[PDB]
Write a protein that binds this DNA or RNA. Structure first.
Length: 127
RNA sequence: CUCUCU
């Protein structure tokens, strides 16, 4: 998006101490951060005893605007009370929605399920 | 005294 004339240069987030519990979080961060800009790719971990998510954007100017608007406060019904801040990494790396993370320019990711191919993989035996 | 090498 980047539809604002002001500065911005940190395209990825810590998103800590959310209202949240599991990987629905990431698609919900997508659904509420889409209101600011072009959210990209997400992690979801229990940070030892806290909860956290970890998200990259397209546009650091929209991500500025969302840190502004969502680090400063929630949005409605006392129900969106995020801590949200820029990373030290500043280019987040997805793994798998197996236990950790998905990406939306990837398929869905998979979960590591992906099968053999009996032309080339099992082909020495195949059955 | 805070941020995933499934």
């Amino acid at each position: 998006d980047a539809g604002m004339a002001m500065a911005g240069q940190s395209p990825v987030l810590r998103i800590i101490v959310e209202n949240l519990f599991y990987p629905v979080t990431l698609d919900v961060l997508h659904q509420i951060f889409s209101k600011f800009g072009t959210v990209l790719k997400i992690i979801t971990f229990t940070k030892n005893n806290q909860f956290q998510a970890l998200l990259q954007y397209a546009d650091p100017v929209s991500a500025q605007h969302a840190k502004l608007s969502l680090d400063g406060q929630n949005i409605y019904n006392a129900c969106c009370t995020l801590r949200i801040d820029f990373s030290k990494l500043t280019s987040l790396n997805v793994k798998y929605n197996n236990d950790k993370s998905r990406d939306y320019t990837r398929p869905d990711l998979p979960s590591g399920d992906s099968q053999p191919s009996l032309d080339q993989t099992m082909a020495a035996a195949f059955g």
